[PDB]
Structures are given as C-alpha cells and as structure tokens.
C-alpha cells in the first residue's frame, strides 16, 4: 500500500568553507518520505516548491531516493525555502505553504496519509492537510498525524490547540513527543497527559520518549517499547525517522492489528536510533542493510 | 573627492557543484563601492542592513576593502538580502536595503559624486533616500550618476518604472544604461532606435554599455565608441557594476568633467568591466591599482 506524505521540503545551507554552503535536503515531510522510500516502501510526496535552484535540487533528492514526485508541483511564482544554519529563515511566504487541495491525488483504500502541525501553519497548506486527511479517511485509508510542534513558526499560537484537536479527530494514529504533551497540556510530567489526544478523539497514540523508546496508548492499555541503547551523536531527524519506520511497517498490510502495530514501533525505534548515531537528518536514515547490521549487535 | 554609493548590499549565492553554493559579497551598490575603494578612491556606502550574519559579514567586507561604512546602519529587526544567481532568485522578500531613509543621508560636499540604480528605487523608504539624496548632492554642487539597473521582477506594478527613471535622469549628471535595458525601457527591438531615451528625459550625458563591445558615449560634441578588452567570460555577474565603479573612480579625481576626463573614465570603465567578468562572484576580480595596470597593458 502506498504512503502519501504531504508537507514541507526545504533547503538548509550549512557552512563548508569560509566562502561556501553545502545544500542539505531538509523538511519533516521530506525526511519521512525519503525514509519510507529508502526502506523499499511505496511513497509519494504531495507538496509545493519553487522552480528555483533549490526546489529543483530537492526534487532530485526525492528521485534519487525513490520518492514519487508526481504530485510535487514546482511553481515559478513561488520561492522554495532556504535556511541559513548556525536557525534562519530567508523565505517567508514559503512555497511549501501554497500546496492546496487541488494538489492532492486520488486516494485508494488501505493507503496511508501523513502530515504534521508544520503543514498546518499557513492557510493554503492547512486545507491541503485537513481536506487531504478527510479524503483518505473517506476512501478507507489511514491517517497518521504527527504533532510536530514549532510554535515559533505560528502567528497566533491560539490556533494550535484547535488544529491539533481537529487533527486528532481525523487521524487514525497520532505520534507525539513527551515534550509536546507538556507544551499542549501544560502538565510538567508527560505521563500526566498520556491521554491528551485520546480525549481529543484518537484511540491510538504513540508517544516518543527519546532514549526511553516509545509508549503505545490504545483503548486496552499502554505498552512500553524501549529503544536500542546507542552512542548518542546527534538527535536531529530522529522523530521523522521514527515515523518513517512506523509508516513503512504499517503499509505492509491492509488492516493493522496487535502484532503489526507492535512491530511497527520496534522498527520505528530502530530507525529513530540510527538517525542519532550518525550526523544530519536525511543522511542518518538507514537502508534495510544498515538497519539489520545495527539491529543485531 | 568622495564617492557616495547608496543602495543594496547582499549575499550572492553562486552554484558551484550540484550540492554547494559559493558565498560572495553581493549587491549592485555594494560592488560599485568596493570597486571604487579597491582602486584607491575615497568611497562611502550609504545603506541599511540587518544586525544579522549577512549584515555583519557584509559590513566586514566593506571594511576589508576600504569602504567607509559610517552611514551603513545595521538594524536587528531587518533581514539582509540573500539571493541565488543562475537569472536571480530573490530569497528575502522585502529586504533590509529597502529601509534607508533621508535621515540616513549624510551631509554632502561640493564636487562629490552620488550613485544609485533603479534597484534602490524599487521600494518605498529607500526610494526617498535615493531621490532626496540625489537632490541634496546637486544642491551642494556635487554630481549624480544614475545607473538604470533594471530588475522588473522585483517590483510591485512596473507602471512606476518609466516615471521614476524619468525623475532620476532629471537629477542625473550622467546616466549609465545597457543596450538591453534601453529596449525593455522604451519598447524596441534595437537599442540604437532608442539611444536618446534618457537624453530626452533630462540627461545630457549618456553612457550605453555594450556587452563585450565596450560602450558608446553620447554628448552633444557627438557620439563616441569605446572597445572593451579581449577577455574570457567565466561569470558576467558584476560587469556593469565594475564598469560604473571604474567610471566613478576616474571622474572623482577632478572637480569638473568633460571629454578628456570623460573619455578617460569610459576607458577605465571598460578595463574594469572586462576584468570583473573573469571570476565567479560580483566583486571577486575587482582589481587593485597594481593589477589594473598589468591588465591595461
Ligand atoms: N538517546 C537515544 N537512544 C536511542 N534512541 C533514541 C534516543 N533518542 C531518541 N531516540 C529514538 O528517536 C525517537 C524519537 O525521538 P524523540 O523521542 O526525542 O522525539 P523528537 O523530539 O525527536 C520528535 P519532535 O521533533 O516532534 O519533538 C525516540 O522515540 C527513539 O526511538
Ligand atoms: N564579455 C565581455 N568581455 C569583456 N568585457 C566585458 C564583457 N562583458 C561586459 N564587459 C565589460 O563590462 C561592461 C558592462 O557590461 P554589461 O553592459 O553587459 O553589464 P550589465 O548589462 O550588467 C550593466 P547593468 O548592471 O546596468 O545591467 C562592458 O561595457 C565591458 O566594459
Ligand atoms: N541586488 C540585486 C538584486 N537583483 C540583482 N542584484 C544584484 O545585481 C548585481 C549585479 O549587477 C549582483 O551582484 C546581484 O547581487
Ligand atoms: K480519530
Ligand atoms: K541525527
Ligand atoms: K540631469
Ligand atoms: K563576475
Ligand atoms: Mg524534539
Ligand atoms: Mg544586466
């Protein structure tokens, strides 16, 4: 089953010499997408980018990695996001924010649709996301909502709670980090908010706990899934890598049951880790071979 | 005599490999300024930048090159212009340079030179800085060199361009324009059919730059042509600005100008125009005095 990823793709510029910048592939939706593909899963990216040098570069990365870019509309009246890292935002109306409902493909039953709160920041992309999730549900598809909070990017932070809630309603599964549970709920202890979304309408919650692995909150109870122990070298991209692994596994069958869900979180942690022993985000994502060599240690 | 340059200072990102960007000081006003300074002339930059990375960085380049930055202010609320050369992707929406205002203008003295392009006329504040700037310099007995450096894309509604160009040429002691801009300016397939466009707008001295050809001088005494040196193109980015820098350096060596000085200025302008096209980056190959001579010959 195909895995649709909708959202942001941007170019991060990192120093190389006293007079150069290395252009790295970035974006939460982008990493997740490359992740699923780089694991042999069928993944399509739904989004928007500028026809500038950056957007073309990005589109190439998707292709080098096996990500279907048929619904990645490259426009010329738009500007692809470029960031200076030290971190910095040069382009603000942002091109990935213009992706709209008419940028969405037809969905098929058992397909998965992904999106984070990041794509809910600016109005156009907001409809693509909410309409996107509604359509996939209507088609007998699954929605995985990853609250990937970045308040800073939000104009009126008063919209956050509302969108998150309306998202948990459409979603089949919600992924959230312990820190986010505290931000949204206000509690100091995340476990005091482990039912935040469950009350907001999502019968299956996956709480990433950093090195402590994951916590599954379903109707019957909560099950802890510890993570492999490793040499923390850089936690960047970890969460996105985690979701990619989860989506890759879930897409391996029409219905997901007990065993599949438990297997997905295991895979999610594996990816999350390898995406921490290395450096970078997209360049930490493993290939089926590396995952095993790492898994069996 | 001091040469004042008012306008844009930016970071030009020049694509090296299909994975890197070359970081170079950019901006038309910036290049011209660094050009005059390198040649040993007294040049001050009048402008605005963000207390940001590109801003502090850029300020540093002006200092390494001998450009007086006493009237260049860095505002934290602003964002220094960053762009990508291809032909120009404008990352930063408005852009700090847009905020120069008449108050930022410095007291002018007699025989000094004031420079500005249509680029500084694009947005609201800076527009006044330029037009009042040129008016004050004239009132002080100084000279104004207007370089129509057309970049239509960066504008609101291009209906303002003809009007501003006309008001500028009125204030100009000398107008510099490229064959190409003339057409774009006054509908035409061939520039010659419009080489009196500005002259009919109030500028009795016009210098039309002609790519690798050199330039054509136009004063009542008649029309004259100057041949540009035989050089190998690597990057044209900056030719025009290097051209004006050389012109301003020569004109500022005297209190009055005429054919002798003027004819010498254009010769120097071509020399610089040639050299600058021999390296990636707008101000990379901007020559020092020693170098200007070994090339002259
Ligand atoms: N120190 C560590 N050792 C092993 N695995 C780790 C790890 N730190 C993180 N991980 C893996 O990365 C996963 C996701 O990272 P984490 O739990 O820190 O959320 P996050 O903050 O990266 C996502 P967000 O950006 O949305 O807040 C963890 O659940 C775990 O699988
Ligand atoms: N190919 C070439 N070989 C040698 N010199 C060249 C050259 N191209 C340009 N030059 C030099 O630079 C000068 C200006 O070139 P050109 O007119 O193309 O710049 P430009 O069109 O960018 C001006 P503007 O900034 O107003 O648009 C030429 O007159 C010449 O002196
Ligand atoms: N600042 C600017 C806006 N659009 C283009 N530019 C500048 O034009 C100069 C060449 O004349 C380049 O250095 C570029 O930064
Ligand atoms: K739901
Ligand atoms: K990492
Ligand atoms: K005039
Ligand atoms: K150049
Ligand atoms: Mg985090
Ligand atoms: Mg030009």
CATH number of the domain bearing residue A120:
3.40.1190.20
CA distance B79 to chain A (A): 8
A68 C-alpha to ligand 9 centroid (Å) = 38
A221-225 sheet: strands from edge to edge: A68-75, A43-50, A3-7, A112-116, A142-146, A173-177, A204-208, A214-218, A221-225
Instruction: Find the radius of gyration of the CA atoms of chain B.
Output: 18
Chain B hits for A21, CB-CB cut-off 8 Å, are 13, 20-21, 23
Give the end-to-end CA distance of chain A in Å, rounded to a whole number. Answer: 31
A81-84 sheet: strands from edge to edge: A81-84, A10-15, A20-26, B20-26, B10-15, B82-85, B88-90
Q: Of the candidates A16, A19, A52, which has its C-beta nearest B84's C-beta?
A: A52
B115 C-alpha to ligand 9 centroid (Å) = 17
Question: Phi, psi at residue B183, to the nearest 5°?
Answer: -55, -70
- A57 touches B: beta carbon within 8 Å: yes
Q: Is A108 left (phi over 0), alpha (psi -120 to 50) or beta?
A: beta
Cα gap A31→A8, rounded to integer Å: 9
- Tell me if A286 sits within 8 A of A238, measured CB to CB: no
The token duo for A271 is 């990816």
Q: Which ligand is nearest to the CA of A144?
A: 4
B179 alpha carbon, distance to own chain's centre: 16
CA distance B22 to chain A (A): 4
CB contact under 8 A, B20 and A19: no
Sign of the CA dihedral B126, B128, B134, B137? negative
- Tell me if A39 sits within 8 A of A248, measured CB to CB: yes
Structural biology method used: X-ray
The token duo for A250 is 């879930």
The token duo for B292 is 């200007």
Number of Cβ pairs < 8 A linking chain A and chain B: 53
Q: Which helix (H) or strand (E) holds A88?
A: none
CB contact under 8 A, B53 and A92: no
A227 C-alpha to ligand 1 centroid (Å) = 9
Whether B238 lines ligand 3, by a CB cut-off of 6 Å, is: yes
- Tell me if A44 sits within 8 A of A67, measured CB to CB: yes
Q: Of the candidates A52, A57, A84, which has its C-beta nearest B53's C-beta?
A: A84
- Tell me if B151 sits within 8 A of B39, measured CB to CB: no
Helix (H, G, I), strand (E, B) or coil at A27: coil
Atom number, ligand 3, closest to the C-alpha of residue B238 = 10
A261 alpha carbon, distance to own chain's centre: 18
Residue B288: closest CA among B44, B8, B38, B25: B38
Q: Which helix (H) or strand (E) holds A297?
A: none
Q: Where are the alpha helices (DSSP H) in chain A?
A: 28-37, 53-64, 123-138, 159-170, 178-185, 196-199, 238-250, 258-277, 288-295
Sign of the CA dihedral B263, B264, B268, B269? negative
Look at the block and give the residue holding tokens 């897409």. A251
Q: Are strands A10-15 and A20-26 parallel, antiparallel or unpaired?
A: antiparallel
User: Which residues of A have a catalytic role annotated?
Assistant: 240
Chain B hits for A51, CB-CB cut-off 8 Å, are none
> How long a stretch of residues is chain A?
297
Q: Are strands A3-7 and A43-50 parallel, antiparallel or unpaired?
A: parallel
Number of structural domains, chain B? 1
CB contact under 8 A, B92 and A91: yes
- Tell me if B208 sits within 8 A of B197, measured CB to CB: no
Cα gap B251→B173, rounded to integer Å: 11
**B219, HSE (Cβ side, Cα atoms, 13 Å):** 13
A154: containing domain: 1-297
The resolution in angstroms reads 2.7
Give the end-to-end CA distance of chain B in Å, rounded to a whole number. Answer: 27
DSSP string, A89-145: B--SS-GGGG--GGG-----TT-EEEEEGGGGSSHHHHHHHHHHHHHHHHTT-EEEE
Between residues 66 and 95 of chain A, which touch chain B (CB distance below 8 Å)? 79, 82, 84, 86, 88, 90-93
DSSP string, chain B: --EEEEE--EEEEEE-STTEEEEEEE-HHHHHHHHHHHTT--EEEEEEEESSHHHHHHHHHHHHTT-EEEEEEEETTS---EEEE--EEE-SSS-GGGG--GGGPPPP-TT-EEEEEGGGGSSHHHHHHHHHHHHHHHHTT-EEEEE----GGGSS-TTHHHHHHHHHHHH-SEEEEEHHHHHHHS--SSGGGGTTTTGGGT-S-EEEEEGGGEEEEEETTEEEEEEPP----SB-TTHHHHHHHHHHHHHTTSSS--HHHHHHHHHHHHHHHHHHTBSSSSSTT---HHHHHHHH-
Atom number, ligand 3, closest to the C-alpha of residue B97 = 1
For residue B117, what are the β-bridge partners? B147
The token duo for A145 is 């909502």
* Helix pair B239-251, B28-38: axis angle to 10 deg: 50
């Amino acid at each position: 089953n195909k895995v649709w990823v909708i959202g942001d793709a941007s170019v991060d510029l990192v120093p190389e010499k006293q007079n150069s910048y290395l252009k790295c592939p970035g974006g939460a939706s982008a990493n997740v997408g490359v992740c699923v593909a780089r694991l042999g899963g069928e993944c399509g990216f739904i989004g928007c980018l500028g026809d500038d040098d950056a957007g073309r570069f990005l589109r190439q990365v998707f292709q080098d990695n096996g990500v279907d870019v048929t619904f990645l509309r490259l426009d010329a009246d738009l500007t692809s996001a470029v960031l200076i890292v030290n971190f910095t935002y040069l382009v603000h109306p942002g091109a990935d924010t213009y992706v709209s409902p008419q940028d969405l493909p037809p969905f098929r039953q058992y397909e998965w649709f992904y999106f984070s709160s990041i794509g809910l920041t600016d109005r156009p992309a907001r409809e693509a996301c909410l309409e996107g999730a509604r359509r996939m549900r209507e088609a007998g598809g699954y929605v995985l909502f990853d609250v990937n909070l970045r308040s800073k990017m939000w104009g009126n932070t008063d919209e956050i709670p509302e969108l998150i809630a309306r998202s948990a309603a459409l979603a089949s599964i919600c992924k959230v980090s312990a820190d986010e549970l505290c931000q949204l709920s206000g509690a100091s202890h995340w476990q005091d908010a482990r039912y935040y979304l469950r009350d907001l309408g999502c019968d299956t919650t996956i709480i990433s706990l950093g090195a402590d692995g994951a916590l599954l909150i379903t109707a019957e109870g909560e099950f802890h899934f510890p993570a492999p122990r490793v040499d923390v070298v850089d936690t960047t991209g970890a969460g996105d890598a985690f979701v990619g692994g989860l989506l890759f596994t879930l897409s391996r069958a029409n219905c997901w049951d007990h065993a599949l869900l438990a297997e997905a979180i295991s895979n999610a942690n594996a990816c999350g880790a390898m995406a921490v022993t290395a450096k970078g985000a997209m360049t930490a994502l493993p290939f089926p071979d590396q995952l095993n060599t790492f898994l069996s240690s």
